[PDB]
Amino acid sequence: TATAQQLEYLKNSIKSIQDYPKPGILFRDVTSLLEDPKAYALSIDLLVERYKNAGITKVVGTEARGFLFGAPVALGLGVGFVPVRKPGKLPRETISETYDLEYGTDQLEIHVDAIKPGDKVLVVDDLLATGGTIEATVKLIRRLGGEVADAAFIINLFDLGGEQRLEKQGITSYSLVPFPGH
Template sequence: MFAAENGLKGDPRLQAISEAIRVVPHFPKPGIMFQDITTLLLDHKAFKHTVDIFVDRYRDMDISVVAGEVISEAYELEYGTDCLEMHVGAVQPGERALIIDDLIATGGTLSAAITLLDLV
């Protein structure tokens, strides 16, 4: 769906990216197919493809900052809870931010990130 919607269907970079991501079955609990991107980060070519696709997709958007990691927001995961943090001052009022979530299962991380940005 992402590939077709963004003109990437058949793009060989997506295959390289997919092959670089390690799938850990039944982690952290049965039924979860965890997508471990640390192997992608170690594959320089596949990681470059990932960055290039992001750059191509967001190049023409007026994004002021990419939110990093320390105000915090707790959130629910499919298998427990966690906490998201962001540096105070990383985003200024009125700036536009891009949120990138490497895995969306329940939307909790994305929701927490939005809550943090709303606090600015």
């Protein structure tokens, strides 16, 4: 389990922006962690350590900030990376899941051939808020016969209840940086 020093370094690497993207939200900006070679390397090293003995066979990350954390974790575990994408971007056969945006609905897609029965999948994302894109991604993985019990995040907004919501869907969340607020 990560040391207190390591977890505090990561928390202090993330910039917060008052009243973005609207009034009353203190936005947690993971791009300041990406620009610090120490913070970014540590985040990936800590996620690789958590799952190295977990029998993961694929990492799935959602477009686009999910790519930044899922793909290095895949490389660190030595397993394939599978992108979940906005519609119309994947060129081979896909399945789709509909989920809620703040101002409407949208879809996520995955290649049908990218997950099979026998796969044990880790989902990786930058930040856990309501958890809606993760729940949609888990449905894509399970519809292809993949087993997914694990989701990893750089940031957890614990006041938004996403860890408990994902636990009701059989997903255990590992998060490096907890922050309060909406």
